[PDB]
UniProtKB/Swiss-Prot annotation:
Subunit relationships: Monomer. Interacts with RpfB and PBP1A (ponA1) via residues 448-472 of RipA, interacts with RpfE. Interacts with the chaperone MoxR1. RipA-MoxR1 interaction in the cytoplasm leads to proper folding of RipA, resulting in its secretion. Also interacts with Mce2B.
Subcellular location: Secreted
Catalytic residues in the record: 119, 168, 180
Domain NlpC/P60: residue ranges: 76-208
Disulfide bonds: none
Organism: Mycobacterium tuberculosis (strain ATCC 25618 / H37Rv)
Chain segments annotated as transmembrane: none
Full protein segment contained here: 265 to 472 of 472
PTM section of the record: Exported by the Tat system. The position of the signal peptide cleavage has not been experimentally proven.
Family as reported in the entry's similarity comment: Belongs to the peptidase C40 family.
Function per UniProt: Peptidoglycan endopeptidase that cleaves the bond between D-glutamate and meso-diaminopimelate. Binds and degrades high-molecular weight peptidoglycan from a number of Actinobacteria; activity is increased in the presence of RpfB and inhibited by PBP1A (ponA1). Required for normal separation of daughter cells after cell division and for cell wall integrity. Required for host cell invasion and intracellular survival in host macrophages.
Name the record gives this protein: Peptidoglycan endopeptidase RipA
Remaining remarks: Was identified as a high-confidence drug target.
Superkingdom assignment: Bacteria
Amino acid sequence: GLWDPTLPMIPSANIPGDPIAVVNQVLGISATSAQVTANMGRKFLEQLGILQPTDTGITNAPAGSAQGRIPRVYGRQASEYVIRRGMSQIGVPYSWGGGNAAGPSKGIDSGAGTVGFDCSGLVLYSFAGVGIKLPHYSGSQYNLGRKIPSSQMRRGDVIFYGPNGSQAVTIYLGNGQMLEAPDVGLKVRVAPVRTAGMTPYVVRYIEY
């Protein structure tokens, strides 16, 4: 009962640090997920009319704090943009280790020749749109943001599975549905929430 038994019962792909997310051979440029995320964060803060010269564009709250860069009054807008980004990826193939802040990508190991998303890749891609920077490993994502009891999960909160949230991570959509990049041969999908292996807390990255 420690893991979700419908998926491989192993820790999710763990891709270290700040990977290159964009490579443009023609212009001769490349950039990492953090750079892509910061740029989107600044664009988002500008769209809210609140961009400051001190803003890098990274909007994460210190882990456990109920206050991040994005004002509470704009949290629902931020959350809905994150969800829109994720939902726009329905139908993209699964790839073990796949995805970065710029979109689906080549995976690692088994997924090395497959462009797509895995669980943490999809979540980090979605949240990057408002400057929320997340590591490409579900266990590490579980240690950021603010814990909410799972019984009180709310649309936009992030659901975790397995010990230390190491197996999988999905975005709660409300109404008992979640957005996930589940397993090989499947695609990014909306599916019923599964409680087997669920961590006792979900994580909130955006307050509203």
